[PDB]
Amino acid sequence: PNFSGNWKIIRSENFEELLKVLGVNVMLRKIAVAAASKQAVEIKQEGDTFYIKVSTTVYTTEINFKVGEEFEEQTVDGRPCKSLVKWESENKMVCEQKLLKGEGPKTSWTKELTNDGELIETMTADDVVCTQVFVRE
Numbered sequence: 493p494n495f496s497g498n499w500k501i502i503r504s505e506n507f508e509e510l511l512k513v514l515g516v517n518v519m520l521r522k523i524a525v526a527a528a529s530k531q532a533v534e535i536k537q538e539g540d541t542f543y544i545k546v547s548t549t550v551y552t553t554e555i556n557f558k559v560g561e562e563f564e565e566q567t568v569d570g571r572p573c574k575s576l577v578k579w580e581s582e583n584k585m586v587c588e589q590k591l592l593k594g595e596g597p598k599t600s601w602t603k604e605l606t607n608d609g610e611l612i613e614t615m616t617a618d619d620v621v622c623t624q625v626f627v628r629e
């Protein structure tokens with residue numbers, strides 16, 4: 493399918509819960525929740541290869557990967573991790589991360605194109621699932 497595009501968030505649920513699992517304290521959790529309101533995702537997909545720029549008001553970060561090939565990124569709370577993205581279906585991919593040092597909750601993320609033109613992105617820590625919905629700008 494075509495993940496490429498310029499996505500703006502319309503909904504973001506359970507983000508505060510996820511940052512709690514990772515040890516973020518209350519006052520900074522509320523600030524990150526407000527930051528997530530302004531999130532944009534830019535995707536260039538050529539075949540199996542994705543270039544993904546995730547950004548808020550004061551921060552931007554680039555995730556370049558190929559389906560099936562290990563790469564390195566960070567978790568939602570900054571720790572470096574090895575990642576591997578695989579398809580689940582035609583329009584959904586899931587990424588499993590493993591920490592490069594130490595220990596912590598089991599983190600992962602998914603991205604899915606819907607039949608209705610939305611990009612749905614979920615990030616998980618152990619049992620807790622944050623769900624984020626975007627539309628093309």
Ligand SMILES: *C/C=C(C)/C=C/C=C(C)/C=C/C1=C(C)CCCC1(C)C
Binds near residue numbers: 525527601602613
């Ligand atoms: C495929 C999409 C991915 C891997 C997106 C990952 C997004 C994040 C790690 C986002 C982090 C943050 C914000 C969106 C704003 C609030 C604070 C952060 C740093 C947890």
